[PDB]
Amino acid sequence: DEIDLSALRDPAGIFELVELVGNGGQVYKGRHVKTGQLAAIKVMDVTGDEEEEIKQEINMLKKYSHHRNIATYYGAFIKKNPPGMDDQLWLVMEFCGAGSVTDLIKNTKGNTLKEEWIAYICREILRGLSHLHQHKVIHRDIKGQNVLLTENAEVKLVDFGVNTFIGTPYWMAPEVIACDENPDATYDFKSDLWSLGITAIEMAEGAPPLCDMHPMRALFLIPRNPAPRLKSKKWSKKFQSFIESCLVKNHSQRPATEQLMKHPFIRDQPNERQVRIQLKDHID
């Protein structure tokens, strides 16, 4: 909106970097220098061109990160560099100590999660997506690495809303993958629901469908193949139904976010606080 980029202070004294957590720009474990409080800091290099988009990402985080299931926005800063050099944009958000769902998977033996854990997380992911979608915002990148956890087992979503490069196809929904049948492929709200389905399979079995397959072949298969089911029939039939609901190739036939939140796998959760404790106990 009407957001002034030049009014952004140099992060000096205000926020500092502690260490690196992941990449992409880079995401750092940062710190509010005075209070000492930790903070997740995303650092981007910035041209005069990207001034348009930056203005809108900042505006986005400012409006829709005020939700229980979305990582909260602290502020934005620019480290200005000599003329001709690119400046560095800092996005400072809430820091989620227990890291990502993906981390959570590598730390549990078997690399698989209790169904009740999967139920809780997905309910929380849906709630954040529900918030997003109501405000006309597509997440676009639902995966274990963009679903963060605090130390109180609070599920928080990150990196929402944001060339001739392609990327990781595994969490892509059939309508996103451009081909001959689907020439002008565009993201939809319901696309996030497909990604969620893949994310739930990622928690259940350890990896997305087509994981041990080359990214170019996986991109090829996702449209033509049937929707992925769970490889095991040892799961509850609610969970199976939930994967079937999320994972519908034809998105016009795919339930909306509101529909899915009412699904028995999501709606019926006793042992909720039992799960939140076992989660807390795991964060060590």
Side-chain angles (χ1 to χ4, degrees):
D1 254 349
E2 302 88 51
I3 292 192
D4 185 23
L5 281 203
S6 69
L8 299 188
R9 307 171 220 251
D10 193 286
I14 309 178
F15 275 100
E16 71 192 15
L17 305 176
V18 167
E19 60 165 321
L20 183 61
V21 194
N23 297 269
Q26 301 163 322
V27 163
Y28 287 94
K29 167 177 172 181
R31 165 187 296 128
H32 191 253
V33 193
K34 246 280 179 47
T35 58
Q37 180 190 41
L38 291 178
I41 314 190
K42 196 178 184 186
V43 190
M44 298 164 57
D45 276 23
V46 156
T47 72
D49 291 334
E50 309 176 47
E51 176 150 344
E52 303 278 3
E53 310 154 343
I54 297 156
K55 206 192 192 67
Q56 194 191 22
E57 162 135 42
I58 295 175
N59 192 28
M60 183 170 292
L61 278 170
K62 212 175 156 197
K63 288 183 173 180
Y64 314 116
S65 51
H66 302 302
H67 187 284
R68 193 168 36 86
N69 296 112
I70 290 182
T72 311
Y73 173 80
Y74 289 171
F77 309 89
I78 296 185
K79 178 187 172 176
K80 306 170 187 184
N81 287 329
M85 307 280 294
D86 266 6
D87 310 320
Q88 290 208 324
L89 163 72
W90 285 22
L91 296 181
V92 181
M93 307 146 82
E94 170 179 4
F95 176 74
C96 301
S100 79
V101 157
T102 305
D103 296 341
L104 168 65
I105 295 179
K106 301 182 168 195
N107 303 331
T108 64
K109 198 174 186 179
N111 303 322
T112 63
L113 302 182
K114 289 173 193 167
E115 195 179 299
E116 309 84 321
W117 288 15
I118 300 180
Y120 175 78
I121 293 183
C122 293
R123 178 169 59 79
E124 302 302 311
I125 297 183
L126 261 179
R127 288 188 164 173
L129 281 183
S130 188
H131 178 70
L132 282 185
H133 294 169
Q134 288 176 28
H135 291 86
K136 311 277 197 58
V137 167
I138 306 177
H139 185 278
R140 292 171 172 267
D141 202 25
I142 290 294
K143 46 167 64 184
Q145 256 191 316
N146 285 341
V147 183
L148 303 191
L149 279 160
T150 68
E151 279 165 356
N152 304 324
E154 302 167 277
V155 174
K156 301 277 193 164
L157 303 181
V158 290
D159 281 332
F160 57 92
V162 287
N163 304 341
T164 49
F165 285 90
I166 323 182
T168 64
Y170 303 103
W171 293 267
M172 293 188 171
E175 67 272 10
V176 173
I177 303 186
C179 48
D180 268 356
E181 296 186 286
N182 185 244
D184 298 322
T186 52
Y187 258 96
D188 191 33
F189 301 103
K190 307 193 199 112
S191 294
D192 294 336
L193 302 176
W194 173 277
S195 300
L196 178 60
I198 301 302
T199 302
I201 291 178
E202 179 182 2
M203 285 180 285
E205 297 170 343
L210 307 175
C211 64
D212 296 340
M213 293 214 63
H214 185 245
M216 291 183 196
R217 271 202 69 179
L219 182 74
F220 178 75
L221 291 172
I222 292 162
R224 316 194 91 187
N225 277 9
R229 298 184 179 200
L230 294 169
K231 304 170 180 182
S232 172
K233 311 167 186 171
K234 304 173 184 179
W235 290 105
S236 69
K237 288 163 189 181
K238 287 188 170 185
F239 187 24
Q240 297 182 341
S241 175
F242 179 70
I243 299 300
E244 172 179 356
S245 285
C246 290
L247 297 183
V248 171
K249 289 177 305 179
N250 191 358
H251 72 129
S252 43
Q253 291 193 317
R254 194 183 300 148
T257 316
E258 301 307 295
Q259 277 194 252
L260 280 171
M261 302 195 62
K262 304 282 175 178
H263 189 285
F265 182 69
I266 303 297
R267 176 65 184 90
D268 306 328
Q269 289 196 35
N271 314 310
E272 169 172 0
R273 283 187 142 186
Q274 301 292 293
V275 168
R276 283 200 48 232
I277 292 173
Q278 299 169 359
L279 277 174
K280 283 183 291 182
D281 285 329
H282 181 278
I283 310 175
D284 295 273

